[PDB]
């Protein structure tokens, strides 16, 4: 059994006096003429908070549970009116399997012909009640309109994903949307929009009043949203090699430091970032943790042996004696440092010499590195592997470990080829890429087109349709009664009439002309 | 992972043996195979090592010239044909997967042989 | 490289099994097996004292004189172990029993 919550669930939002006033607030609120759950002892979802309401002849319902679990496990908030006294405590309860009345804790306090509204949200912690009692003669809740006021703030701490109501009743829930409330003189509210219900209630928030003039107003914009999700990387099925760069033998020495290509593989990055046997994970012009979701055309690992207090001379903007003389790192440098202490791999050991980016000069005015295993932690020596990072502006080679999907064409999808990202609908192009070139893109420095990774074929995207949205009002005075105008959209992609101006819903169209009114474009009123 | 071998085979002097291996359970172009002879009543012996991802093997000296390996990455397998045996090479030849030398660059690396097969015998 | 390797001892007793090598190596290139009577070899410790994935086992050593311990013996490592050198090729010693 479900019921209609008409205009119901609106309760002051704050202990802030307004007077004569239209104020616009977003808040949790049972959305208007929302979809409610009539019952005659279920547990239901709390979500974001709940709406609740009951109707009474004898005082039937007595109270709430609000929790987890509700098992004995973990705290739970225990609202019960028995007889005459009020008791909310939050203790670790044992609860029966059907608990009903008849005829480990952090907080304790004791204090149809009737309709009893109530509001249950938890915020960072705090539990609200708000509430509101009035008289009905009434199968389902009142027609009406009042707002709920706040009485009880409990400092719990208490996750609540679930509640049950003990002992008719109704169950809504809240949801973050914007209305426009109407503060009398009095300071109570009378009246409100919801701002997310139709046409001319977007209206009425835009212009900030209950009542609009006649005319055309723009209130939102359209957008046509994607139906699926496209990850598109080249079909590799090669394991990429960083286990044979972190687990290496032997190293070299930081004059002459190894560099070794990465290519044509798969590279799975969860190993290095979730390992803990690494004393600095450090990346530049990457998160650590997106290094899965992207793709670099190569990628360069370049590994050597330091002594402990240098390895903060592998980095970007600095100086030294790596930094100068041997290992030197671009400022705009793009890939993640990636060290290790090596005081039992490498210590005996004076076989590690040391003296623009990148540039490995080998000539021979060299020292050694005098490398035990009793010396102090900045005397140690640490392996380090650099891995540079070559970003997407060339066909990619190196992808991390994503599944890849179908490609679906002619719809609006999330899609992403090699690391790019973006909405849209992809089409078959007429262009002609050079064999280097993944893709192309246009004035605004966006892709215009991109070359399928598995498949050789060229796509243009084009942005999902939108345009600016009009509400056509005769003024509320006469009629409640709108149209819409979609603005430079197709009627296929939003009593519907198509123009220059865009698609107009819900007006008729008529043959003979007339003197303008309501403009809407290109001739059209 | 799991490694498995062919059954066991007989052979006469101077005849030659084709030793199977496949495996599963993981990406097959990261690890090389390692072959290890075991004579009855003897120890450990390496014969080699080849790359699944480039074809690069390397070999122990006293098979040098002797054992051929190569790899099929299509079905997940690997191959050691032993060319001109003798009774001296009575022994179990085991296929093992290998940490130890990197698949795609040829270095050594900190590891050892992990997953091993069952060992065929050959006669 | 050659090694040569050097068990009667009761279950809850202590092991140390070791190996020498005719020349040095790196440490780290060091790998220790343990293969039960009709069974493949399986790897212990790898890295001279890492321990295998899977795996009371513990190794250390440098130079050229490396051991293997068990804490406590089990019925289960009643096996022949291998020392293992890769650094430079690859050889193993010929073997220790325990019983």
């Known amino acids: 059994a479900y019921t209609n919550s008409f205009t119901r669930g609106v309760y002051y939002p704050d202990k802030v006096f307004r007077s004569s006033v239209l104020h616009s607030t977003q808040d949790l609120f049972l959305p208007f003429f929302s979809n409610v759950t009539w019952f005659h002892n279920p547990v239901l979802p709390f979500n974001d908070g709940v709406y609740f309401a009951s109707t009474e002849k004898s005082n039937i319902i007595r109270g709430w549970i609000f929790g987890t679990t509700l098992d004995s496990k973990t705290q739970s908030l225990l609202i019960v009116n028995n007889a005459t006294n009020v008791v909310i405590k939050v203790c670790e309860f044992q609860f029966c399997n059907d608990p009903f009345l008849g005829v480990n804790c952090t907080f304790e306090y004791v204090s149809f012909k009737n309709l009893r509204e109530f509001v249950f949200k938890n915020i960072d912690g705090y539990f609200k009640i708000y509430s509101k009692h009035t008289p009905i003669n009434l199968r389902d809740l009142p027609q009406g309109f009042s707002a709920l006021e706040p009485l009880v703030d409990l400092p719990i701490g208490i996750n609540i994903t679930r509640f049950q109501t003990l002992l008719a009743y109704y169950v809504g829930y809240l949801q973050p949307r914007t209305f426009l409330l109407k503060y009398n003189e009095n300071g109570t509210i009378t009246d409100a929009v919801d701002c997310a219900l139709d046409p001319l209630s977007e209206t009425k928030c835009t212009l900030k009043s209950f009542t609009v003039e006649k005319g055309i107003y723009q209130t939102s914009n359209f957008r046509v949203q994607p139906t699926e999700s496209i990850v598109r990387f080249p079909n590799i099925t090669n394991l990429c090699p960083f286990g044979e760069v972190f687990n290496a033998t032997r190293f070299a020495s930081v004059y002459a430091w190894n560099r070794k290509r990465i290519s044509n593989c798969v590279a799975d990055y969860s190993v290095l970032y979730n390992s803990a046997s690494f004393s600095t994970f450090k990346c530049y012009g990457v998160s650590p943790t997106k290094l899965n979701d992207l793709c670099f055309t190569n990628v360069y690992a370049d590994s050597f042996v330091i002594r402990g207090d240098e390895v903060r001379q592998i980095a970007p903007g600095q100086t030294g004696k790596i930094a100068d003389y041997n290992y030197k790192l671009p400022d705009d440098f793009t890939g993640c440092v990636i060290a290790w202490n090596s005081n039992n791999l490498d210590s005996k050991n004076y076989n590690y010499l040391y003296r623009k980016p990148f540039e490995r000069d080998i000539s021979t005015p060299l020292q050694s590195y005098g490398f035990q295993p009793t010396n102090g932690v900045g005397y140690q020596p640490y392996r380090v592997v650099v891995l540079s990072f070559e970003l997407l502006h060339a066909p990619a080679t190196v992808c991390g470990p994503k599944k890849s999907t179908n490609l679906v064409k002619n719809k609006c999808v999330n899609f992403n080829f090699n690391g790019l990202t973006g909405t849209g609908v992809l089409t078959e192009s007429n262009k002609k890429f050079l064999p280097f070139q993944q893709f192309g893109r246009d004035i605004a420095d966006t892709t215009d087109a991109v070359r399928d990774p598995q498949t050789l074929e060229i796509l243009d995207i084009t942005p999902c349709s939108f345009g600016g949205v009009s509400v056509i009002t005769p003024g509320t005075n006469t009629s409640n009664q709108v149209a819409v105008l979609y603005q430079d959209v197709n009627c296929t992609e939003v009593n519907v009439f198509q123009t220059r101006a865009g698609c107009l819903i819900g007006a008729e169209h008529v043959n003979n002309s007339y003197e303008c009114d309501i403009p809407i474009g290109a001739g059209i009123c | 992972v799991q490694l498995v071998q062919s059954g066991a085979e007989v052979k006469k002097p101077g005849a030659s043996v084709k030793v199977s291996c496949k495996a599963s359970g993981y990406p097959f172009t990261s690890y090389g195979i390692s072959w290890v002879r075991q004579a009855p009543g003897q120890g450990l012996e390496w014969m080699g090592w080849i790359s699944t991802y480039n074809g690069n093997t390397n070999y122990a000296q006293k098979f040098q010239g002797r054992v051929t390996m190569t790899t099929d990455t299509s079905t997940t397998t690997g191959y050691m044909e032993l060319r001109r045996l003798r009774s001296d090479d009575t022994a179990v030849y085991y296929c093992?997967?290998?940490?130890?030398?990197?698949?795609?660059?040829?270095?050594?690396?900190?590891?050892?042989?992990?997953?091993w097969g069952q060992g065929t015998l050959v006669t | 490289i050659v090694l040569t390797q050097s068990l009667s001892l009761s279950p809850g007793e202590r092991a140390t099994l070791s190996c020498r090598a005719s020349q040095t190596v790196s440490s780290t290139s060091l790998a220790w097996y343990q293969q039960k009577p009709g069974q493949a070899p399986r790897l212990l410790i790898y890295g001279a004292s890492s321990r295998a994935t899977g795996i009371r086992f513990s190794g250390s050593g440098s130079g050229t004189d490396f051991t293997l311990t068990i804490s406590r013996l089990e019925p289960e490592d009643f096996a022949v172990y291998y020392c293992?050198?890769?650094?430079?090729?690859?050889?193993f010693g010929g073997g220790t029993k325990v019983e």
């Open positions: 293992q050198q890769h650094d430079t090729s690859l050889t």
């Open positions: 093992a997967r290998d940490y130890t030398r990197g698949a795609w660059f040829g270095e050594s690396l900190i590891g050892g042989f992990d997953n």
